[PDB]
Amino acid sequence: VDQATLDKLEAGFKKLQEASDCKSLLKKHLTKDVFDSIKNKKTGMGATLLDVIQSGVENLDSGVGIYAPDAESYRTFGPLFDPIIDDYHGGFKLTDKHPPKQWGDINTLVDLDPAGQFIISTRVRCGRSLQGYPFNPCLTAEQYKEMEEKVSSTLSSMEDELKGTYYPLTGMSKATQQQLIDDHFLFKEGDRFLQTANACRYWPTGRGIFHNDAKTFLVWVNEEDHLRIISMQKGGDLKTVYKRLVTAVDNIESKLPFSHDDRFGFLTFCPTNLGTTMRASVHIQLPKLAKDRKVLEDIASKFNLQVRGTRGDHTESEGGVYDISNKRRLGLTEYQAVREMQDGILEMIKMEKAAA
Ligand SMILES: Nc1ncnc2c1ncn2[C@@H]1O[C@H](COP(=O)(O)OP(=O)(O)O)[C@@H](O)[C@H]1O
Ligand SMILES: [Mg+2]
């Protein structure tokens, strides 16, 4: 690790301290003991501690603040990753290991809001990393193209309900892109947290989205993770949404080789997405409970749920529509993760109905 990097790190560490109002897990778990312990470490691909915390240093409003430039980083900088992972996922010891993939009994899931007065739409997604390829910050332009080719070709083999087309971002009209994003289908452009983590190099090369004509099954290619496999639709039929996702992931997995870790389960770029990599969500309106975003968030937190704005991560709620989902993804099965969202949303709906 060169002197320049050390300077930026010491300065980075410095800045975090003087940020008396910073509430990121990076700030919380990067003690000087932790800091001095790994600051001189470097991975087999050159990833350094700066590559890990840079996003969190530059964006103090980060909730977490770190990313893994490569798989090795999870262990090389474990002293920082471990406590942050334990904290975020609500309990994941140094000795714990993520359980085997378990979709569970799909028949036990239910309709989330029969009368349809609160829920607008339901979505469940997973993330996957391609074996043979490192995470965004270590990828070259040629690798982005390679991966895009490999994934788009595999998806052309999907059949029946999952049959669809791949739409490259490179060459996509600004109007179409803007629509696909506004419709909540496509990942947005230029996320400051991802950018400062050097995860958006060579954009839009190798980036794109596959989706069936109904746009109920979609696959993001090369955004935050190599792949994001999504199932979504209007309403609250979580059962159908989940089943579609399960069908799609089982199928894609028999065709592509994905990185899985004995301890961390499926590997992803952000520590928040490890394990099941599952984020089950609903776009929902809860007039009484969501009078004050803070009150809604405190309520959601007790059900292990997370609140986001209508356009996703770090956005505001628009028209009273909130994105509420299971916060935890590692240390519990796929079934358990979707159930935390189902259970908490069913109850919050009950609380809203009983609110004055
Ligand atoms: N339940 C949902 N219904 C419709 N759109 C949703 C829903 N949940 C998330 N989204 C959309 O997914 C997109 C990405 O959001 P983000 O918060 O970054 O989630 P992700 O975990 O998939 O990366 C946004 O356009 C967001 O509005
Ligand atoms: Mg996202």
UniProtKB/Swiss-Prot annotation:
**GO cellular component term of the entry, any:** extracellular space
Question: Taking every annotated instance into account, which residue ranges of this chain make up the domain Phosphagen kinase N-terminal?
Answer: 8-90
Task: Give the location in the cell.
Answer: Cytoplasm
UniProt binding sites for ATP: 121-125, 184, 228, 279-283, 308-313
Which CDD domains does the annotation name? arginine_kinase_like (cd07932)
Q: What is the effect of changing residue 318 to V?
A: Reduces catalytic activity by 20%
Keyword entries, A-Z:
ATP-binding, Cytoplasm, Kinase, Nucleotide-binding, Transferase
Which GO terms fall under molecular function for this chain's record? arginine kinase activity; ATP binding; creatine kinase activity
Function field: Catalyzes the reversible transfer of the terminal phosphoryl group of ATP to L-arginine.
State the family named in the UniProt similarity comment for this chain. Belongs to the ATP:guanido phosphotransferase family.
Put simply, this protein is called Arginine kinase
Q: Which organism is it from?
A: Limulus polyphemus (Atlantic horseshoe crab)
